[PDB]
Amino acid sequence: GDAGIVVAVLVILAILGWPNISSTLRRW
Amino acid sequence: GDAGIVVAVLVILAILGWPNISSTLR
Amino acid sequence: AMLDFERKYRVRGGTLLGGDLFDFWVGPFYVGFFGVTAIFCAVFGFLMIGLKAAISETWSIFQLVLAPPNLENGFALAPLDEGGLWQIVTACAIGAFVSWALREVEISRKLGIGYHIPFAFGVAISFFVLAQLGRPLLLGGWGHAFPYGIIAHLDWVNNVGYQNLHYHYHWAHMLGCSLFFATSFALALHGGLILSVTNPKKGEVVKTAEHENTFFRDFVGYSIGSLGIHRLGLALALSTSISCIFGILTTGPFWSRGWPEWWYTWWPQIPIWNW
Amino acid sequence: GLTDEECQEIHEMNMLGMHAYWSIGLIANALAYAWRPFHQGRAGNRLEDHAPDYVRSAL
Amino acid sequence: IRTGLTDEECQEIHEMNMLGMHAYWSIGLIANALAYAWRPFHQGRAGNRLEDHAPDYVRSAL
Amino acid sequence: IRTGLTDEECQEIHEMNMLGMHAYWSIGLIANALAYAWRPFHQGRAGNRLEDHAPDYVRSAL
Amino acid sequence: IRTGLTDEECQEIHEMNMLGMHAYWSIGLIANALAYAWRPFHQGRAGNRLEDHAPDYVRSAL
Amino acid sequence: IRTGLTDEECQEIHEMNMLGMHAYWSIGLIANALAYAWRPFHQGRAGNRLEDHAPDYVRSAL
Amino acid sequence: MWRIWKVFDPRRILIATALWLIIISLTIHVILMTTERFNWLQGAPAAEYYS
Amino acid sequence: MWKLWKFVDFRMTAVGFHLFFALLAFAVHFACISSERFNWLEGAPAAEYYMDEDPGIWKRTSY
Amino acid sequence: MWKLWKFVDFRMTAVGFHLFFALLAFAVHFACISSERFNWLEGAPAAEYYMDEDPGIWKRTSY
Amino acid sequence: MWKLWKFVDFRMTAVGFHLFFALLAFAVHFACISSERFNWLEGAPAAEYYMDEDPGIWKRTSY
Amino acid sequence: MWKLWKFVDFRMTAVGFHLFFALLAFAVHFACISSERFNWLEGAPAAEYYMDEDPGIWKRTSY
Amino acid sequence: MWKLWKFVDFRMTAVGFHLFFALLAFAVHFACISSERFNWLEGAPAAEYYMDEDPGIWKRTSY
Amino acid sequence: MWKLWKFVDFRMTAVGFHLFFALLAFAVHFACISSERFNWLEGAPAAEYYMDEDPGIWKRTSY
Amino acid sequence: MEAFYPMGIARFDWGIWAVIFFFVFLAGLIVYCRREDKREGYPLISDPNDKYGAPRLVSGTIPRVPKPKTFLLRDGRTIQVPRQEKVEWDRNYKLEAQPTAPWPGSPLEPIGNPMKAAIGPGAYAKREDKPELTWHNKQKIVPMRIATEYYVVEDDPDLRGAPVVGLCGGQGGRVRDIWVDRSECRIMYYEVEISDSVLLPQCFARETRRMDGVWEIRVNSITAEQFRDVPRLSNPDQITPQEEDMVCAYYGAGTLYAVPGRTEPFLP
Amino acid sequence: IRPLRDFTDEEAQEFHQAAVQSFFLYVAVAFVAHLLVWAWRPFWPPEQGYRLEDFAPEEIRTDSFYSDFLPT
Ligand code: A1LZM
Ligand code: A1LZM
Ligand code: A1LZM
Ligand code: A1LZM
Ligand code: A1LZM
Ligand code: A1LZM
Ligand code: A1LZM
Ligand SMILES: C/C=C1/c2cc3[nH]c4c(c3C)C(=O)[C@H](C(=O)OC)c4c3nc(cc4[nH]c(cc(n2)[C@@H]1C)c(C(C)=O)c4C)[C@@H](C)[C@@H]3CCC(=O)OC/C=C(/C)CCC[C@H](C)CC/C=C(\C)CCCC(C)C
């Protein structure tokens, strides 16, 4: 359902946006 | 029923946390 | 984030209550224990205001009010939906105002200045306290105190004034309106004088205290001076707050008829002209 | 600054004060709970729902 | 403060910055996903007013 | 009148500004696209008042 | 009376000013064209009041 | 803490103070005795309200 | 994240946190008092009981 | 008009223009909201939906 | 947390906790006074008086 | 416009933009809340739920 | 944005963000409270209880 | 008027004229809104739509 | 706890305690006056006068 | 949402539109007043007590710090506010104090004697080192021994020779002379001789009539001993704004540092 | 210049460890409290909700969370 898609997308954003994962993209 | 359970839990916590016993586990 | 000369004064001590634990600055603000308690009371009172906004479904700063309990409630604790939130916010506001004034006492001690500012603020706080406690004590309940709404306390002012028919004629209201008008008049005069002395026409030098003295001597025959204008200003604003105390504590408690009838009761019958 | 032994004394005083108050307040809450348990059951504990309709309820 | 932030100082500030921002971001995303699975935030074309779906006896705050 | 910033400081501030502005811009465009697909913001000539399309029992605040 | 900016500083300020002014101008023109095609802003002599063109049952906020 | 007056200054001040206080005291005692003989200040067990002792036609402010 | 204590005073952040905790704790307790299900003082029945 | 920045502070002009345009965007969105035809938030029908001919803007139309 | 008082001033922490607990005791006693079940000053009956079964807590009772 | 920070303070610009966008996010969310069609908190039905043709935006539909 | 703190004070940014997010979290929890569907304190039923089909969010459902 | 800037401050004049024309553009768009003939937001018909002849402006028409 | 005065001022502690206890004695006496059961100034009867059994405090009494 | 000719349409009326215009003007007026506020102490400087460097862009710029204001003075000088001598004075100000903690916003505890540290309430600004004159180039702040034309009014106590007592009641000194402001016609300072002469700001002096009938000056700020450490005058018969500011700052220092207690709370 | 008390990097790490452990112990205690509250009365409404008016008979007085004091 649409709500299931929203919840899955939010969870995926939380996983990808988690510091241990988002910090893998640091470019200094 | 469970009111006695809460009273007993609070009494046990009071006895354990009393300074004469709280200091024994310092 | 700190004034060019600020660090020179940012020293420890001067606390009434708080020691060195709360004796610090967050950005520009000095904190102190009374700053901590002022933030507590302010934020908790605003959260209770938001709670009333939630339960009343009134998410409008203008339409939202925390009203005191009903008159029949007396001094009893009210339900939060029946004036209890107003009582909580009254305690919060008294606490926040007192904590703010005491933080200003701390700041005055730290700067070595007199406590005149927290004293004047405490005069305003005394109005609030006597309005929200003295009027309930006089009239027998929290319901006689004004509510906490941006617009709705104006409605309370309207209705309490019209309870005595024509509130303009109230002696304390007449004196206090004269005092507010005199305070704005004197603030206009004083700001204008200081700016006139320090901002003459372009190309003119900054004038002196002699200039401003002779300006008001030429203007109205009297110049109150540098010290006198600030003493008179503190006096005018304070006295208007005391007049507010008397007005809010007398309309109803000490005259339940019209203030027009109050004036008729004594002034026309003064025997020097009642014949 | 606070010396090691001064922090020691402050620690015993703080432990005594907090634990004495905590235990006295736990006994106080246990007594108030035994007197009337604080939290209502699913049926609630409003008088109006259980009293025989002539017992006045402030609620 | 007689000198500005070094690249090292600014980098160690930004490490904590990114940790805090992205931890809050992910925890908020999880919280919002939980609240969305609880009750989806956005109504469908049918809406989600009780008055439009519940029977008459189900009181609604509108 | 001049902020005192060098060309390097101005350019790195501008890199950060372009990042923030355009990231916010793209995230907001995606959010507005999602909200527009949920409910188009702009009514057609028919409008989208519920009173004009829904039956009488569909309560409308308008 | 004078800002003290050099000719080069004024010209770079002006190129930024032109870019910003004309970008905003063109984006606003496109936005106003889109809103005008959505609903022409100015009524004809007949007007565009719903009371004058819609049937009686179509409610108008006047 | 002290007024600095000498013993003799205090003695003459006290002479005047006793003179004034006791002259006022005796004049007031004579005045109160005269007013008391005129109308005793304190009512008996019967009181001295007119309404309790005077006929009905004697108006009383109580 | 420990380096935040180079940025901010741990004592000041602790004071702000304790202040915030007191504020929100009292606010939540009063909010529950405003509710029907969670007002232990009012003691209303729960919907699971079907009072 | 680059020379304008020799006499008129550009920071003043740009900051004031951004402030005024925030003001003006609010003002104009308010004007649209205040118009039934243009209130997208309430979504009233356009009179063109019920008209047959194009009303025009400058077109000389008669009843 | 033995060394906490080495860093955080214990003296003002205790003074502030005493003031805050005076306020909290007043608030909590007032909450009890506001409660009909718990206002000892008014002495209202408990609902347990008039109910045959124990109400319980977490009891999963049913009507 | 990397040269804008030669003349315009970036801290002022960024702080003011963040404050104005906080205010504007609040204002825009409240504008949606005021709208029946867009108030997700109240969850009113969409008119497209009740019309069997696409309303369009520029579709040039007629009654 | 790793160079932002060379220019914008991180203490200001972090404190202001924490204060604004405290205010915003209050505002959003209160916005849920204001919503019948989302007021978890009152616990009103969701309309999904009374509808057999899934309402959707972007689903092009019809009456 | 090119010598006016020898005697009148140009930044004062230009800023004052921009402020005044902002206020006047507001007030004049408002005067249009105040007119039934000219309120485009309300969109009332023009009287020319109903009369079969050109009213004119300076034309010496008679009833 | 004899060492508290090496850290906390005893003079102001005792002064604050005496002030708070004067205020609290007034508050508690006013609480008793407010209570109908405990107002000795009005002297209302105790319900135990009319009860035919001891109510108790923790006694599990039933109607 | 009716049209309200000629008063608007829906809520787009001129009540609200004059409201909006006046709020715009009030916002501009608050911005103007804030810019005027930023004529002293700005641009801001971060706290040097900081484990991190200073950000390139400083706070206090949302209303821009205005271009420094030019004041023309009677003496022919053209001063520019903020006055850079004051700014450099603040930059190079000897602290005689250390931060209590290593973070910004930490208070400064003076290292040694805080009465002599000129820190906190004892801090003073850089002011003119030339004595201020009236409009007629007369010494503005002058002792009554020089300005014989100025006299204490008959109804008021002439405290020349009156005892000056400190915080603890000890005899700080005796009033040698009274310094008056020619323009303000007020007592500015009491010259207090110590048994050398110091100055005592009038607002730091309580002229109290003892029950002896003898008038004295009670100085709550400092003690009798600390009167010996009041900043002296470079010229005995004239005082510069800098010396006025130093003396007032010394007594302000006493308000917090004269005795160990007055810097401490009731309950710490 | 030099602060009286200094807060070293290792002292910062030690405080951060202590504060993180304290925060997590505090959160764990609060979570146990929330578990007790939930077992008492769950605070996330189900699909059917938990308004007492929706389940109790009309003889049971149910008061809505929202009050009619400000009909705005
Ligand atoms: C019912 C209930 C509810 C809720 C709840 C709550 C509480 C209680 C709280 C909260 C919050 C918060 N959120 Mg939320 N919600 C809600 C919704 C929402 C939304 C929508 C969409 O709607 C959003 C977007 C949000 C978001 C948020 C943030 C901002 C914060 C944080 C988080 C974070 O981190 O992020 C993270 C997370 C997140 C979610 C974010 C992200 C996304 C992404 C980009 C996407 C976007 C999209 C869009 C906008 C479009 C739409 C469409 C439709 C169809 C139309 N929220 C509901 C209604 N809360 C918090 C605060 O405020 O703090 C400060 C709190 O407390
Ligand atoms: C119908 C009816 C009516 C009325 C009513 C009435 C009554 C009942 C009364 C009154 C009053 C009066 N008024 Mg009026 N009115 C009329 C009118 C008038 C006029 C004309 C023109 O016509 C004029 C000018 C007038 C004025 C006046 C004055 C004077 C007064 C006021 C002021 C006050 O009070 O305040 C006072 C006030 C006070 C002080 C206050 C304080 C705060 C606190 C602490 C502070 C803090 C807070 C906070 C919140 C914080 C913030 C934060 C930030 C923001 C962050 N009128 C009508 C007729 N009436 C009072 C009195 O009496 O006084 C005397 C009273 O009671
Ligand atoms: C009707 C009418 C009347 C009157 C009248 C008047 C006038 C008009 C005047 C006066 C006076 C005066 N008084 Mg006489 N009376 C009155 C009464 C009385 C009394 C009572 C009890 O009853 C007293 C005690 C008095 C006393 C006095 C003095 C305090 C002063 C001062 C003087 C002297 O020194 O003598 C002197 C002194 C004297 C006389 C005093 C003596 C001690 C004694 C022995 C001791 C004992 C006591 C007691 C209290 C007993 C009780 C009884 C029973 C209750 C049974 N007054 C009546 C009611 N007037 C004056 C004045 O105030 O000035 C300031 C005036 O002008
Ligand atoms: C219902 C609901 C709703 C919404 C919702 C929300 C919330 C909640 C929020 C928001 C927002 C925001 N948005 Mg929106 N919306 C809406 C609409 C709109 C519009 C229209 C017109 O329609 C616009 C234009 C917007 C836009 C925006 C921005 C500006 C910001 C950010 C984003 C960005 O950045 O990018 C993004 C951007 C964008 C999207 C834009 C771009 C260009 C474009 C393409 C072009 C074209 C235009 C035009 C104007 C024309 C059309 C009209 C006609 C008629 C057709 N929104 C609805 C009504 N929100 C935010 C804020 O405010 O922040 C502070 C928030 O919070
Ligand atoms: C000689 C000497 C001495 C002393 C000493 C000392 C030391 C050393 C110390 C102390 C203490 C103390 N205390 Mg004291 N004291 C004395 C007295 C007294 C008295 C009388 C009157 O007599 C009293 C009553 C007292 C009490 C007290 C308290 C306040 C404390 C305890 C703590 C606690 O609480 O634990 C325990 C813990 C706990 C309890 C935890 C709690 C959760 C939280 C919050 C709660 C919150 C809540 C909320 C907000 C919500 C509710 C709402 C409603 C629903 C509405 N004291 C003497 C004078 N000491 C501590 C402290 O502070 O800490 C830091 C310490 O260390
Ligand atoms: C009716 C009536 C009543 C009361 C009463 C009173 C008065 C009058 C007072 C008080 C108090 C006090 N409490 Mg209480 N209560 C009550 C309950 C309670 C609670 C619940 C559970 O709910 C809590 C948690 C408390 C607590 C307390 C503390 C905090 C303080 C101190 C104490 C101590 O120390 O120890 C003691 C302590 C303690 C007890 C604490 C511990 C546990 C742990 C965490 C666990 C928790 C859990 C939870 C929350 C969940 C469950 C529930 C459900 C729903 C199932 N309170 C009732 C309602 N009071 C005080 C004060 O405020 O301070 C100042 C006073 O004055
Ligand atoms: C419904 C709706 C609506 C709208 C809407 C909106 C919003 C929401 C907004 C806007 C805007 C804006 N717009 Mg518009 N509109 C509208 C109309 C109009 C008009 C008319 C006439 O009508 C105009 C002229 C305008 C204009 C504009 C600008 C000025 C800005 C800027 C942008 C730009 O740049 O562009 C760009 C620019 C532009 C577009 C301009 C152009 C020149 C041109 C060629 C010339 C002109 C003509 C004329 C005036 C004549 C008359 C006609 C007849 C009568 C027939 N709008 C509608 C009614 N909005 C914005 C603002 O505000 O800013 C801040 C916004 O936010
Ligand atoms: C005769 C002398 C006077 C005088 C003197 C003077 N007032 C001072 C100072 C001095 C010397 C300060 O030194 C102090 C300051 O710092 O700013 C300059 C201050 C201040 N007064 C303020 C507001 C002010 N004052 C007014 C009247 C006079 N003020 C009289 C005329 C009036 C009105 C109606 O006339 C207003 C609205 C703030 C800006 C500030 C306090 C902040 C605070 O309390 O913190 C505490 C911080 C906050 C955020 C307080 C929130 C507390 C509760 C929980 C929030 C809910 C609010 C209420 C329940 C109040 C009733 C609402 C009405 C709608 C019914």
Side-chain angles (χ1 to χ4, degrees), chain M:
Chain M
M1 301 295 177
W2 83 266
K3 291 179 182 289
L4 186 69
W5 321 121
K6 283 180 21 163
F7 309 99
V8 183
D9 180 32
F10 171 73
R11 267 176 209 91
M12 183 277 293
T13 305
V15 165
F17 265 80
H18 275 84
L19 294 183
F20 176 78
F21 274 57
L23 170 75
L24 173 67
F26 284 147
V28 172
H29 275 96
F30 278 122
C32 312
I33 293 160
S34 74
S35 172
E36 181 185 3
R37 172 181 174 79
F38 303 132
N39 191 11
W40 71 103
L41 310 164
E42 177 62 21
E48 282 95 337
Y49 192 44
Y50 304 103
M51 62 180 78
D52 194 11
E53 70 274 16
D54 180 69
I57 297 89
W58 299 268
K59 193 147 61 92
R60 300 291 185 268
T61 63
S62 280
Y63 188 44

Side-chain angles (χ1 to χ4, degrees), chain Q residues 2-20:
Chain Q
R2 182 79 270 172
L4 288 160
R5 181 175 290 171
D6 209 313
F7 197 72
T8 59
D9 281 21
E10 64 270 16
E11 186 173 359
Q13 285 155 336
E14 186 174 1
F15 174 84
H16 190 74
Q17 293 297 109
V20 162

